[PDB]
Amino acid sequence: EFTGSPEIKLKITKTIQNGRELFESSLCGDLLNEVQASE
Amino acid sequence: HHHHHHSHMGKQASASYDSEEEEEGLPMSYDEKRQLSLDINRLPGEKLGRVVHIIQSREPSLRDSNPDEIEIDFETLKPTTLRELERYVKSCLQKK
Sheet containing A9-13: give its strands across: A24-26, A9-13, B69-73
Closest CA to A14 of B60, B90, B84, B70: B70
Q: Are strands A24-26 and B69-73 parallel, antiparallel or unpaired?
A: unpaired
How many Cβ atoms from other residues are within 10 Å of residue A14's Cβ? 15
**CB spacing of A10 vs B52 below 8 angstroms:** no
User: In terms of CATH architecture, what is B30-93?
Assistant: Up-down Bundle (1.20)
Taking the CA atoms of residue A23, residue A9, residue A3 and residue A36 in that order, the dihedral angle to the nearest 10 degrees is -60
Our CA-based measurement puts residue B92 at a distance from the nearest CA of chain A, in whole angstroms, of 18
What residues in chain B have their Cβ under 8 A from chain A's Cβ atoms?
30, 33-34, 37, 40-41, 44-46, 48, 51-52, 55, 67-76
Angle between helices B79-93 and B30-41 (to 10 degrees): 50
Task: Kindly list the residues from chain A whose CB atom is less than 8 angstroms away from the CB atom of residue B72.
Answer: 9-12, 25
